[PDB]
């Protein structure tokens, strides 16, 4: 055939892929963390947005740190051969490199490692997107007038 450049990911597989949304609104009193009002609005907005992009959206609410890891591990062990990509959205409290389960923190690294090129072969060479709504520290931006 003619010249082939391969400058863009192949996104015409049978399925666009999964869009896993972890929506943590209520946290265990034991942690002292406050509820995240308005997060359900985000969760619903995301479900509709990615639905229209043809993703298989799966939502989960108020997951413990153990459940977050179990969910990610299970999903990573699925056969993504017919899927073009993978999307995971995390909605919760957080700190740099950490996302909070309802009973404690989870290293983002632990979550993403399940999808490494060598650990999830059916996603090797395919885009793995992680969208994160959470704090990354305690600095505030005073902004500047323009």
């Amino acid at each position: 055939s003619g010249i082939s450049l391969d400058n863009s990911y192949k996104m015409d597989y049978p399925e666009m892929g999964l869009c896993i949304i972890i929506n943590n609104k209520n946290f265990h009193k034991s942690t002292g963390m406050t509820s995240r009002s308005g997060t359900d609005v985000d969760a619903a907005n995301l479900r509709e947005t990615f639905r229209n992009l043809k993703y298989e959206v799966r939502n989960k609410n108020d997951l413990t740190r153990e459940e977050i890891v179990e969910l990610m591990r299970d999903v990573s062990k699925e056969d993504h051969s017919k899927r073009s990509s993978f999307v995971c959205v995390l909605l919760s409290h957080g700190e740099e490199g950490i996302i909070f389960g309802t009973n404690g923190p989870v290293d983002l690294k632990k979550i993403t490692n399940f999808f490494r090129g060598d650990r999830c072969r059916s996603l090797t060479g395919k885009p793995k997107l992680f969208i994160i709504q959470a704090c990354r520290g305690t600095e505030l931006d005073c902004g500047i007038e323009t």
Partner: protein, 103 residues
């Protein structure tokens, strides 16, 4: 030219390649959420995807999200410490190709 670190017989890619992290805020900063309308970042991300997913490459869509959050939002708080603050999303790309949701 020739060297010890290029043109391997067995092709391999980094195990960390092809990941994209769309962070709501800059490293070390708080991230803002409106108790009624949702987070500034997700609100903006969905809006830009709905409007440009069938027209722009993903990084360009995320750049529009960066601009929307940076210009349109400013915090409101009875606590002066957290009042009138700004936010800039942070795109972290280890992708190796352009990404279009359409084909």
């Amino acid at each position: 030219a020739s060297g010890v670190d290029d043109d391997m017989a067995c092709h391999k890619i980094p195990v960390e390649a092809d990941f994209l992290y769309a962070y709501s805020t800059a490293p070390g900063y708080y991230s803002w959420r409106n108790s009624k309308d949702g987070s500034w970042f997700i609100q903006s991300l969905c809006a830009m995807l709905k409007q440009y997913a069938d027209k722009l490459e993903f990084m360009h869509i995320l750049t529009r999200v960066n601009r929307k959050v940076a210009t349109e939002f400013e915090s409101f708080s009875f606590d002066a410490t957290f009042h009138a603050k700004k936010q800039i999303p942070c795109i972290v790309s280890m992708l190796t190709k352009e990404l279009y949701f359409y084909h």
